[PDB]
Ligand binder design. Structure first.
Ligand SMILES: COCCCN1Cc2cccc(C(N)=O)c2C1=O
Length: 351
């Protein structure tokens, strides 16, 4: 029998489920049958990113014919997909290229997860307890009556964007997060600390909790990252929640809240994959949104500003303009993971 709080038991059971990872990869068209997740290697993933660079080259030159077909076929050979009887689809847009980056990120997190979930041959501990220990990340459930639950609930609801109307979110459980080493590494000296959202797919949480949020590797396509290879956050819960890729079938997702040491922001109206080079002493990039929470409503929680909603106009308009802010830091030492929300997505099929 498990010695964990039942809330933690259910969380661990959810994120450490290998079959759920398999099903998630199958939904993304990855061929789990022919290329078992247990046998996938970091070298194979790295080569996958390299083949995306060649696709990126085609996209940035608007070459959509045989050169693109060949580049996509190379990627599909390295990272097996299951397209049934259909001609393999081409990867033609920045959006489609981003989906493939997301796949490789998920594969890397699953590679980590499969190693982590291995249990001891003989042990006095329940499997759930071994998985939990192997995270090296404390997860302490908070009561729904608590002040922290009240404020985080308010943050979640008040920053659900009105343009993200396809679903609502219900907070099922809330955990305080303390990742081994993060406090010691954190730039607690930097000003402008904010409590910001980060969403990710369900397959990714074992990786994120055990290794923290990470930046993209040098081999990844540069233009797959609209503000460069950093760690991306939102001040709108639903902007991050969209990156959970929850569905009617799998409607439980997680959202992470982290204390982010932004320091001096470099404010940008337009996307620039080379943004990190423009910092010139500044500590973070802020993609400037049309709509944002306003300072009048902000509260503090454990030394971080909480940008409570609702969102309203920022006076920012362009070319393209971001709907909502996004914040990018380029070193994990500017992040301290703080809360993990177990969220039920309630989908509305609107027409
Ligand atoms: C290929 O991936 C590029 C980064 C994609 N982006 C952009 C972004 C903005 C705001 C929040 C988030 C988040 N995950 O919560 C993200 C995100 O993942």
């Amino acid at each position: 029998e498990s010695q964990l709080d039942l809330r933690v038991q259910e969380l661990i059971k959810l994120i450490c489920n290998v079959q759920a990872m398999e099903e998630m990869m199958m939904e993304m068209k990855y061929n789990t049958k022919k290329a078992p997740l247990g046998k996938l290697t970091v070298a194979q993933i790295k080569a996958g990113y390299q083949s995306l660079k060649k696709i990126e080259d085609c996209i940035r030159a608007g070459q959509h014919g045989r050169a693109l077909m060949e580049a996509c076929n190379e990627f599909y050979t390295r990272i097996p997909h299951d397209f049934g009887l259909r001609t393999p689809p081409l990867i033609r847009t920045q959006k489609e290229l981003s989906e493939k980056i997301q796949l490789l990120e998920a594969l890397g997190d699953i590679e980590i997860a499969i190693k982590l979930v291995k249990t001891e041959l003989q042990s006095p501990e329940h499997p759930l307890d071994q998985h939990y220990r192997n995270l090296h990340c404390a997860l302490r459930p908070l009561d729904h009556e608590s002040y922290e639950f009240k404020v985080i609930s308010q943050y979640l609801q008040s920053t659900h964007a009105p343009t993200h109307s396809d679903y609502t979110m219900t907070l099922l459980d809330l955990f305080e997060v303390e990742k081994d080493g993060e406090k010691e590494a954190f730039r607690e000296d930097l000003h402008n600390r904010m409590l910001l959202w980060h969403g990710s797919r369900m397959s990714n949480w074992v990786g994120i909790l055990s290794h923290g949020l990470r930046i993209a590797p040098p081999e990844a396509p540069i233009t797959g990252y609209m503000f460069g290879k950093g760690i991306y956050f939102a001040d709108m819960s639903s902007k991050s929640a969209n990156y959970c890729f929850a569905s009617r079938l799998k409607n439980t997702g997680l959202l992470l809240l982290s204390e982010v040491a932004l320091g001096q922001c470099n404010e940008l109206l337009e996307a620039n994959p080379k943004a990190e080079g423009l910092l010139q002493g500044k500590h973070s990039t802020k993609g400037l949104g049309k709509m944002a929470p306003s300072s009048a409503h902000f509260v503090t929680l454990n030394g971080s500003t909480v940008p409570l909603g609702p969102a309203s106009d920022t006076g920012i308009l362009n070319g393209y303009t971001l709907n909502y802010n996004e914040y990018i830091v380029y070193n994990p030492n500017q992040v301290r993971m703080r809360y993990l929300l177990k969220v039920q997505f309630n989908f509305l099929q609107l027409w």
